[PDB]
Amino acid sequence: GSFVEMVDNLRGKSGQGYYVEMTVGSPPQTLNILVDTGSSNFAVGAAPHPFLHRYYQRQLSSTYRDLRKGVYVPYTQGAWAGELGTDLVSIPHGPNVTVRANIAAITESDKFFINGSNWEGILGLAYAEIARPDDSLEPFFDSLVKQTHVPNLFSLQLCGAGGSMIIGGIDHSLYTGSLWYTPIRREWYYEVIIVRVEINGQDLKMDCKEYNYDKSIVDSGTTNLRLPKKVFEAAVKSIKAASSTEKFPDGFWLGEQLVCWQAGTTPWNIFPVISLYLMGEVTNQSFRITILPQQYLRPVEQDDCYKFAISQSSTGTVMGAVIMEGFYVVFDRARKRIGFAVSACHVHDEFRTAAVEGPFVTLDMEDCGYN
Ligand SMILES: C[C@@H](NC(=O)c1cc(OCC(=O)NCCCCCN)cc(OS(=O)(=O)Cc2ccccc2)c1)c1ccc(F)cc1
């Protein structure tokens, strides 16, 4: 395909975050940057840190421009403090352009960087509304689109146990079947609306407003499929019931205890598939994405240990890596929609595969959103 050079430009397959190489400053300073659709700030470690192998050295960049303003960004897991500036930025295995972007030099941090993760910064791909200090600090992708010809669209193929980030388009070799789109409800986080949830085909039977209580987002920076407390509780009960041929401790379901199997003997078959129906592009029409235990049971560095990766949240549903690793996801910003298609690299077995199917009839989907 025409976008071949961007294929396989991500790393972090069996790791702690998917990252892409980004070259900043002049002379060139390339760093590993976490791909995060759950935030909107581009920031890079700029001082030595125990978990960082390399960092941004502003004094060595002749093109660096100090903005003379501090910036602080808290996340679900950790936070960092830094200094704002702008510099030249290019993505070697991404678009063939170079833009001057806002860059936050991370000088201090608390539980942000992850030991052994190999990434030294973060690329917040969400919208300006949630950028810090405020929405006036233009995010990287916004700069890319405004300064260049690059189409306002990117797509992610996260390959778990690194993947491809196609910028400006789509590569058809990354998925099979059809692409199904759900509207981006509002441009801040990549917010979507979930209208129905099934465990092995069985409806969880909860008011859809509960599935999006507060909000539902697609976030490549979050490991798990996080669900509102009420939904999490009902989901776990149903999953346990469907996998009753085997019993596991309560801690396993809370992500506190790991369960290991002899190398290559994990009974994937005893666990149910999980389906999330998303609002479609046509009135009263929806489609569903289905993941396998290979997606929600994550390996932990002759024993194969796994952690149940569906957890609870008090800030809404978060469709993280657990969801994204089963699909090729198209962030069509230009048409305010997110597309899903079965990923050509998703992990499965000879009996089941992840799926994206439709259409389905779902009424009153507009009422599912939180106001
Ligand atoms: C990068 C990594 N992300 C995480 O481990 C990560 C990020 C989160 O919130 C967003 C956030 O903090 N974004 C800010 C950027 C990340 C900062 C991390 N301190 C929440 C989160 O919590 S969780 O519900 O998934 C349970 C959990 C906790 C710790 C480790 C694994 C799983 C885990 C990640 C690992 C694997 C992936 F496939 C994708 C992402």
Short description:
This protein is mainly beta. The chain has helices at 140-147, 208-211, 229-242, 250-253, 293-296, 321-324; strands at 10-11, 19-24, 29-36, 42-45, 65-74, 79-90, 99-110, 121-124, 154-158, 163-167, 175-183, 194-199, 202-203, 216-218, 225-228, 259-262, 274-279, 285-291, 297-299, 303-308, 310-313, 317-319, 327-332, 337-343, 355-361.
How much of the sequence lies in strands comes to 35-45%
CATH architecture of the largest domain: Beta Barrel
The CATH superfamily of the largest domain appears as Acid Proteases
Which compounds are bound in this model? the ligand C[C@@H](NC(=O)c1cc(OCC(=O)NCCCCCN)cc(OS(=O)(=O)Cc2ccccc2)c1)c1ccc(F)cc1
Q: From the helix content, strand content and strand pairing, which structural class follows?
A: mainly beta
Overall CATH class of the largest domain: Mainly Beta
- Structural Rg: 20 Å
According to CATH, the fold-level topology of the largest domain is: Cathepsin D, subunit A, domain 1
> How many domains?
2
CA(first)-CA(last) distance: 42 Å
Q: What helical percentage do the residues reach?
A: 10-25%
Shape: globular
Biggest sheet details:
6 strands, mixed, barrel
In which order are the strands of the major sheet placed? Answer: 2-3-8-4-7-6
How many β strands by DSSP?
Answer: 25
What is the count of helical runs? Answer: 6
How does this model look, in words?
By secondary structure, the protein is mainly β. The protein has two domains: 18-150, Cathepsin D, subunit A, domain 1 (Beta Barrel); 151-371, Beta Barrel (Cathepsin D, subunit A, domain 1), CATH 2.40.70. Helix content is 10%, strand content 39%. The protein contains six helices and 25 strands. The protein has a six-stranded mixed beta barrel with strand order 2-3-8-4-7-6. A hairpin with a 4-residue loop joins strand 23 and strand 24 (337-343). The longest helix has 14 residues, at 229-242. The N and C termini lie far apart (42 Å). The ligand C[C@@H](NC(=O)c1cc(OCC(=O)NCCCCCN)cc(OS(=O)(=O)Cc2ccccc2)c1)c1ccc(F)cc1 binds at residues 16-18, 34, 36, 38-39, 75-78, 111-112, 114, 122, 221-224, 226, 311, 320-321.
